Design a protein around this ligand. Structure first.
Ligand code: PGU
Ligand code: PLP
Lengths: 401, 401
């Protein structure tokens, strides 16, 4: 109904930008992964990927890949061949128990974070997770599309309202005028260098019982003790009014996504969502290599390797912040947005850096608003001090301010 | 409607059936995959899975497993670490080129058939796929809920209608009274033992240019040359008013799902869907073992091994139909629905069969309508003549006819 994520019908301007990005080779490239966060082209040239989302370099960990191979060798199937509602392989239960140990919460895996949003948001909107009381579903304007695109489903169940980024004052007003409210947002935003305002949100939760739904896809692993993420690091123990969705193919170094339902010893939320007609019931479970990767990555997150990787990541951020200005400086979030304010210039920049051995993803309309084009750089712990310094060199040679 | 004691009485009823399924052990079981389509419990007791969706038994193919392990070894990463819009691994291109050669069509992979539905249904609803003219979106009542749960997304774009199951009369009427119509249906229904009315549908398409959207999850690999499925077996070459979505974790013996955009030499539908804000743009690509499995399975589907597997499957269907009466008896698709109506009888029957070495999944509400419960058997090529004959023996001891 009212809340919506309409398909873009006017695409002459946007198709022109996509076509140019492909023509310039910054999009549509067939590149091979190569050690050291690098990309190999058909001609043989090698570039450093500055926009990779494996923030801790776990996509290159031989431990994790070996545990994925081992899981497939011993199971000898890619997957079970029934819905998880009927049965699961012991490997799936071991993976979800290992994630539950790490996050300190009841956690289910799904084939993606997007499937996890589809499985949870309509159910949250129905009241079933809020004592039979349909909440007002309040979305942040900059919430990821995996969640925003499902507003119409949420509106089929309750009232959906979208508020301005971090408009805490407006959310409080909605809270004061309604019995039950929920806020759908991203813990770490991939643009603008912003973060979810936890202090005010937790207070509203205390005062009004505001249900908090967070997308931690850029928070898992990169932030917090044992990489539990930004929300759990501040919250400590998850409560019954907070639910988290996340991807495990980024910092965690595995594949798929997950729903952090709440307290580990309360099965009501898992029960409710597992028995609802959505992706957790009828979409394929993660295959056994992915589940092996999850188990090994979880052990690694619980060990002394995670602090070291977060250390090397915070260092590489400081090194980058000392040599290049970008949206976000000293926020300790490994995403830096190189504002260029010009679609044509962002694509030209991207094509230049790539010819110089550095790929930085070009953000243009419709990905970002018009005239707000920029290059999105992601800092990994797997970057060398040289990679970072050698890149700041080539960036200034472009002479953009 | 909420506030109806009935909808709460119905929930207490449904929660009772799900609780019984868990108590009876037909749901919630942790079971290991065992050779020959079998499942092992920790006490060492084993059951034949009469409900596996690996219709050609490819879940146990050593060739596919080996290819999946090899893909992980050579690539040395679980996946790439950017949106596929920026770039892709050569392995992913090899997979999609392989599927494309196999179906004779442009084909993209995604992490699930559900994601394929999410990526395509709103776009078809918008008109961008049908010459700028938003079609009337006509959903069959029994279309799988990965499609049907998204009707609201489509309704925001255009008019959505639901017709009675296989009601080709009602669909033709809609084609007369409207300029452009689309029909969303399953080629082979997930349960209920019914198929799509292809002859009538193809005629309506010739007369009114009706766009046909088919979910081929239970058709892929099961039927047709090179396993191209039910629709393409009868259509021949794909036209530009037909789109197919399918899963590749069932008969194909791999992981993930796929969108069959249409003819191989028209890039428009892929471009439009790839540039829309859905899972094809911002949800993770399949991991490298999954892509290795897709490639090896495609080679398999081109070889003489596929018609051998299809012959064994259809021979097992003939054997089963000669011995057990189920919805779908006589057709050439593996789904056989044993209608029991009562949810109590259905759960008791599944628990009885499971205690006697045969797992048969129980469909009750919300999987199917109330009072329409039943056991969902699925025929697969990995079934022995004795597995089927013995299941028939145990089944008939209940005295249902
Ligand atoms: C007709 C149909 N289309 C799409 C899907 C979704 O496929 P995915 O690729 O997994 O997203 C299903 C799932 N029906 C499966 C449920 C499978 C599972 O949960 O593992 C079934 O056959 O029972 C289906 O039956
Ligand atoms: C914040 C956020 N949430 C969700 C997703 C998608 O997650 P997945 O690929 O697991 O579906 C992304 C990736 O683009 C993301 O950046």
């Amino acid at each position: 109904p009212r809340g919506s994520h309409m398909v873009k019908k006017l695409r002459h301007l946007s198709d022109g930008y996509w076509d140019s990005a492909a023509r310039l080779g910054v999009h549509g490239a067939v590149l091979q992964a190569v050690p050291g966060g690098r990309l190999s082209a058909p001609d043989g040239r090698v570039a450093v990927n500055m926009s990779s989302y494996s923030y801790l370099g776990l996509d290159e960990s031989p431990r994790i890949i070996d545990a994925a191979i081992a899981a497939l060798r011993s199971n000898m199937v890619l997957n079970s061949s029934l819905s998880r509602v009927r049965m699961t392989l012991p490997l799936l239960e071991e993976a979800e128990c290992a994630l539950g140990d790490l996050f300190g919460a009841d956690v289910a895996t799904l084939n993606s974070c997007s499937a996890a949003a589809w499985a949870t948001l309509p159910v949250l909107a129905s009241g079933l997770l809020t004592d039979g009381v349909a909440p007002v579903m309040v979305f942040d304007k900059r919430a990821h599309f995996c969640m925003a695109s499902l507003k119409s489903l949420c509106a089929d169940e309750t009232r959906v309202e979208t508020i301005r980024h971090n408009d805490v004052d407006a959310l409080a007003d909605i809270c004061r005028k309604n019995k039950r409210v929920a806020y759908v947002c991203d813990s770490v935003y991939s643009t603008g260098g912003t973060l979810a305002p936890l202090e005010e949100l937790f207070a509203l939760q205390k005062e009004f019982g505001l249900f908090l739904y967070f997308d931690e896809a850029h928070s898992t692993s990169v932030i917090g003790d044992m990489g539990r993420g930004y929300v759990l690091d501040r919250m400590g123990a998850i409560n019954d009014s907070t639910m988290l969705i996340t991807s495990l193919n980024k910092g965690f170094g595995a594949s798929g996504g997950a729903i952090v339902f709440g307290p580990r010893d309360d099965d009501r939320k898992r029960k409710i969502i597992q028995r609802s007609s959505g992706p957790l019931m009828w979409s394929q479970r993660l295959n056994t290599p992915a589940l092996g990767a999850i188990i090994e990555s979880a052990k690694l997150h619980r060990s002394e390797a995670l602090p070291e990787l977060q250390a090397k990541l915070h260092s590489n951020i400081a090194l980058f912040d000392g040599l290049v200005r970008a949206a976000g400086q000293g926020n300790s979030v490994p995403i830096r947005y190189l504002e260029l304010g010009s679609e044509v210039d962002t694509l030209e920049a991207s094509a230049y850096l790539f010819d110089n051995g550095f790929y930085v993803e070009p953000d243009f309309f419709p990905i970002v608003s018009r005239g707000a084009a920029g290059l999105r750089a992601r800092i990994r712990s797997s970057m060398s001090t040289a990679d970072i310094e050698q890149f700041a060199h080539v960036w200034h040679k472009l002479g953009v301010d």
